[PDB]
Write a protein that binds this DNA or RNA. Sequence first.
RNA 1: CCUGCUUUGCGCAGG
Length: 216
Amino acid sequence: TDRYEQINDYIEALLKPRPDNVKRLEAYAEEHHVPIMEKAGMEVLLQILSVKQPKKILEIGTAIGYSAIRMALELPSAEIYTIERNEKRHEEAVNNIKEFQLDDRIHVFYGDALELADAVHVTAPYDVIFIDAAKGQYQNFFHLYEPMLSPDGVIITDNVLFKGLVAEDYSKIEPKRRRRLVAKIDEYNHWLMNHPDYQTAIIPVGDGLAISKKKR
RNA sequence: CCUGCUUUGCGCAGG
Ligand SMILES: C[S@@+](CC[C@H](N)C(=O)[O-])C[C@H]1O[C@@H](n2cnc3c(N)ncnc32)[C@H](O)[C@@H]1O
């Protein structure tokens, strides 16, 4: 283990216990290798949300519903619109949401987010947009959905550090597919951090968070 | 085998 790992493990060990039902979702994801947000990142996301107190949240990338559920439990008034392209995950998410009795406030679209803008627009604007899908597609999601953000909204992108690979010399990573993806995330970070219409900060927690707030 | 897709890490589209 290195510093980065040790720090992550230290944070996870300081966490307050989650409710048994949330614990079941975490254990399922771990058993089944469903990617779900890492624990330390999720806590930071939640705290940012608790400060902001958004009314409406758009999430790209539901998986089995874990991050949407946690957000909704943190924000009992919020409505969440989430998108998942994998039909089996979509089904699991819907079923988990129903078990938590949150289906009145969390609504899960099936399909590729790049093809669902018209649907999502019906319930725009969103005070928070959380991008948590498809490594190679962040800029595309941003351009498609940023016009739907409320005035003082925040856009949060997950997985902007790719295990630290983005911050190293990655020029000889194999296979090439992976090298190309790391380069594409590095590109996104540079593009988004340079953007004069947003104030963005990178948070090196979990897989790395970018928090972008739209200026006036 | 190699190149593109998919995946958090065997099947398509090419050479
Ligand atoms: C890392 S996971 C989601 C983690 C989830 N937010 C959580 O913590 O509970 C990424 C998910 O995005 C979905 N996904 C990938 N590309 C997508 C796209 N273009 N549109 C919609 N969903 C997508 C995948 O099927 C996968 O379930």
